Amino acid sequence: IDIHSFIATHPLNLTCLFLGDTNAGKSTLLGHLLYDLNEISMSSMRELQKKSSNLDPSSSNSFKVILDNTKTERENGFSMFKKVIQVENDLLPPSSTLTLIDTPGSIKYFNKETLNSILTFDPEVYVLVIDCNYDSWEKSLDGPNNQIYEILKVISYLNKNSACKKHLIILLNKADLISWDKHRLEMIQSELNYVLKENFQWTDAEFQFIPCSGLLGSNLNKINYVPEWYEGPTFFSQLYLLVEHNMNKIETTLEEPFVGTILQSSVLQPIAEINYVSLKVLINSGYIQSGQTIEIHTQYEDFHYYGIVSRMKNSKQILETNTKNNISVGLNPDILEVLVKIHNTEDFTKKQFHIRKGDIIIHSRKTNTLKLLALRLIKLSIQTHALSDPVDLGSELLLYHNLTHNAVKLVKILGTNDISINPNQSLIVEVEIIEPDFALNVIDSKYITNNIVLTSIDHKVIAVGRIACQ
Ligand SMILES: Nc1nc2c(ncn2[C@@H]2O[C@H](COP(=O)(O)OP(=O)(O)O)[C@@H](O)[C@H]2O)c(=O)[nH]1
Ligand SMILES: [Mg+2]
């Protein structure tokens, strides 16, 4: 196989991450978009609807149940886990893929997954979904620490001074509940536009507003109606352009060292002298091909495993896909099932694998080698902005990095004798892991971002930054 040629025939991907409070209409809208993009067969729908007969009458609808596909989510009536859907069809630009990602707005689960989804997937586009119904909009803006502002406190400040520019779509959803109240939609747009510009430093070219109804599908593409006074674009038309302009992008895949994030892990049973581990892997950079030797580094201090890639398949997705056929090569940013073969050195019943979410996988460096750090004392290059109360030294914080979030202690504010972090500062800071026998896996490379977010124990954003390896 050419290998070099496989990278060429690979379609260029755009990732869209959906964010917003619970009941914003995210799951409904995203499922509806998938239907409009002909990713759901009428038969598939009705089979979903034949199951939905349970819900007549009910609050739920036919579109959200597409994404809320776990039994616990259907019973609870809201999303709990992030859903990743990769779309590739004739409605998109040729040689491209559109990755859509649903996230939970329910705060308990928002804190568990949504913040990490931003760091892990590193999306080109954010989609903020807002319920514009009467009273709902007003109730969702209590103080400077409301959930919507918390979202903006992250995505507004990630990768400042970056070459590639930011892209934000604000969806003014449930427009039908207000009958497209022109004065009200104008108000909400006015208010957000101000806060985005004045407080979060967004520029006109970096964001736009789109009123819509995910349930009715109004203004998603191409009483459902778009008022005569609306001159703006549809949601999908804008996604289409973003994908198109993302085509003209530099691909350094060949120069990139292979790095993967383990999203899920399962050891095949019964265990034996040689064991086989099934991994759901998000490729962060470079490329992986079956047969290659690899290293699996765990969150547990040290404790790395050597193995070989036995086979690779497409990840089990919400949309109907082929999980039977093997894949020759895995390329950034696709997600693959990876079966890893691992020889145990000693007794195999005493020693057992401790592979978990957030663990990483790289190509083998067994004897320009890839630099890898296992850090308990972590140096952070951060920048603060609006801050209610300064953060004094010795404070307990939560360090979000890639897929993991760990409690840390603030131990040193470098460059100054100050004993507290203050508003609007660019600081260098050291934090120390609290959890015993735990170490943060950090890859030192020009190709890896290592973005972080510091929050309080109450999950309120304090700062954004990067791991300072040097
Ligand atoms: N009237 C109206 N209701 C909606 C719309 N989108 C969602 N909903 C309702 O909002 C509730 C929660 O929607 P959901 O898709 O789960 O939003 P999520 O919680 O943010 O993921 C559901 O019971 C829907 O009936 C819309 O465009 N119009
Ligand atoms: Mg949802």
Side-chain angles (χ1 to χ4, degrees):
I1 297 297
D2 199 325
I3 309 128
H4 169 282
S5 183
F6 198 109
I7 298 173
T9 190
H10 197 44
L12 272 42
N13 179 78
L14 185 97
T15 302
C16 295
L17 183 62
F18 289 74
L19 302 163
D21 297 332
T22 182
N23 198 45
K26 303 186 298 304
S27 293
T28 291
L29 182 144
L30 191 43
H32 201 145
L33 182 59
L34 287 169
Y35 175 78
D36 290 12
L37 291 181
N38 304 315
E39 290 295 331
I40 313 291
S41 300
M42 292 296 225
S43 303
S44 307
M45 191 66 69
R46 288 164 193 159
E47 294 275 277
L48 238 60
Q49 302 207 94
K50 230 170 285 191
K51 270 198 274 158
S52 82
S53 74
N54 166 277
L55 319 153
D56 183 25
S58 186
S59 79
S60 166
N61 68 90
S62 297
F63 298 113
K64 63 173 289 180
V65 292
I66 300 175
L67 282 90
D68 297 344
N69 66 345
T70 66
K71 295 180 177 180
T72 180
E73 279 172 322
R74 316 196 134 143
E75 188 69 7
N76 276 272
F78 57 87
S79 315
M80 296 165 60
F81 321 99
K82 75 188 83 70
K83 307 307 195 317
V84 177
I85 301 128
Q86 179 158 297
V87 185
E88 195 185 359
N89 62 5
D90 52 329
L91 290 170
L92 298 177
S95 306
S96 77
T97 53
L98 178 66
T99 301
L100 307 171
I101 303 178
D102 191 12
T103 58
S106 189
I107 190 66
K108 192 207 177 191
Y109 306 97
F110 173 89
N111 292 337
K112 279 236 286 133
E113 276 176 58
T114 304
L115 293 178
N116 288 102
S117 74
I118 294 170
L119 300 181
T120 300
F121 291 103
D122 189 43
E124 290 91 345
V125 187
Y126 303 109
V127 182
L128 184 60
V129 191
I130 288 138
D131 185 4
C132 299
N133 188 30
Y134 299 111
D135 298 320
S136 298
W137 164 250
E138 293 75 0
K139 286 169 179 172
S140 61
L141 297 167
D142 178 23
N145 285 9
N146 67 75
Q147 178 168 359
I148 297 178
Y149 285 7
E150 291 297 304
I151 287 169
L152 295 173
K153 274 164 180 180
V154 177
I155 61 168
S156 299
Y157 299 135
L158 282 181
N159 313 282
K160 281 212 282 170
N161 191 254
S162 62
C164 54
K165 225 213 301 153
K166 310 198 216 68
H167 290 105
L168 170 64
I169 297 173
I170 303 114
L171 296 181
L172 305 181
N173 198 11
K174 310 208 196 176
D176 54 315
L177 289 179
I178 59 175
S179 296
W180 289 79
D181 188 341
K182 195 191 179 231
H183 294 332
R184 184 177 173 76
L185 289 170
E186 282 175 345
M187 183 188 68
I188 293 177
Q189 177 165 337
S190 174
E191 292 172 334
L192 276 168
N193 178 79
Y194 174 93
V195 177
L196 281 170
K197 277 156 154 282
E198 300 302 330
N199 299 91
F200 291 105
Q201 303 165 8
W202 286 82
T203 52
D204 292 318
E206 287 178 320
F207 67 98
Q208 62 161 127
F209 297 82
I210 300 176
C212 63
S213 176
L215 182 60
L216 301 187
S218 319
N219 211 29
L220 274 188
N221 54 92
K222 68 176 202 74
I223 293 291
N224 169 33
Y225 72 95
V226 184
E228 71 290 345
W229 52 260
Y230 182 68
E231 314 286 44
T234 70
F235 180 44
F236 179 66
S237 66
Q238 291 301 126
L239 292 186
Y240 189 99
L241 297 174
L242 283 161
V243 172
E244 180 179 345
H245 302 161
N246 199 73
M247 301 291 289
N248 314 322
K249 176 135 91 178
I250 311 122
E251 246 193 356
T252 59
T253 308
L254 289 67
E255 302 162 312
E256 285 170 14
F258 170 63
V259 181
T261 300
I262 298 164
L263 316 169
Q264 195 186 350
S265 179
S266 64
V267 184
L268 276 45
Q269 298 283 325
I271 52 176
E273 192 67 28
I274 295 171
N275 299 284
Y276 289 73
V277 185
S278 182
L279 303 170
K280 200 189 255 210
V281 177
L282 170 60
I283 297 180
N284 301 113
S285 67
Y287 59 91
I288 187 74
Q289 40 185 341
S290 187
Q292 277 181 311
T293 312
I294 50 145
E295 292 181 12
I296 305 172
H297 297 260
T298 61
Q299 274 145 62
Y300 284 97
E301 204 185 29
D302 202 47
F303 224 161
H304 67 324
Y305 302 103
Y306 300 82
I308 297 175
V309 183
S310 298
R311 65 176 203 236
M312 300 189 299
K313 301 170 143 63
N314 288 328
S315 177
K316 219 153 294 196
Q317 184 187 142
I318 292 186
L319 296 179
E320 295 282 22
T321 172
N322 194 244
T323 49
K324 293 294 132 200
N325 289 2
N326 287 10
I327 283 81
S328 302
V329 192
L331 290 173
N332 172 26
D334 58 39
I335 299 172
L336 299 172
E337 296 293 345
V338 184
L339 188 62
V340 177
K341 157 171 162 181
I342 305 172
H343 300 254
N344 299 33
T345 71
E346 292 245 22
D347 178 306
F348 64 86
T349 189
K350 314 270 189 189
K351 267 297 209 206
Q352 293 178 336
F353 298 97
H354 294 354
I355 301 172
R356 292 146 58 74
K357 281 221 307 178
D359 295 345
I360 65 171
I361 172 173
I362 60 175
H363 191 272
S364 181
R365 33 205 248 291
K366 71 196 190 316
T367 65
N368 202 350
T369 71
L370 180 53
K371 182 53 161 175
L372 180 59
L373 307 166
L375 305 172
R376 279 189 58 83
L377 187 70
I378 307 168
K379 204 185 293 177
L380 303 174
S381 178
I382 62 173
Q383 49 271 12
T384 58
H385 290 80
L387 202 62
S388 310
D389 318 270
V391 186
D392 298 332
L393 280 160
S395 290
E396 280 183 315
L397 310 173
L398 298 175
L399 177 61
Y400 286 70
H401 175 262
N402 197 28
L403 202 58
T404 59
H405 43 256
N406 301 109
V408 299
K409 181 176 180 184
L410 171 50
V411 293
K412 199 186 199 184
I413 305 174
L414 285 67
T416 324
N417 299 335
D418 296 350
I419 46 75
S420 75
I421 299 174
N422 312 122
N424 307 280
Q425 289 182 324
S426 292
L427 297 171
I428 305 302
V429 175
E430 280 180 359
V431 295
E432 189 183 355
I433 299 292
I434 293 173
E435 189 173 11
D437 300 318
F438 181 98
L440 189 69
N441 295 320
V442 181
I443 291 170
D444 194 345
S445 174
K446 69 175 98 72
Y447 301 103
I448 304 301
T449 67
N450 282 317
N451 291 326
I452 67 99
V453 181
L454 279 172
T455 77
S456 63
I457 307 303
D458 195 28
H459 304 106
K460 301 300 177 191
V461 180
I462 295 165
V464 160
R466 268 179 169 88
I467 307 296
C469 303
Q470 263 69 36

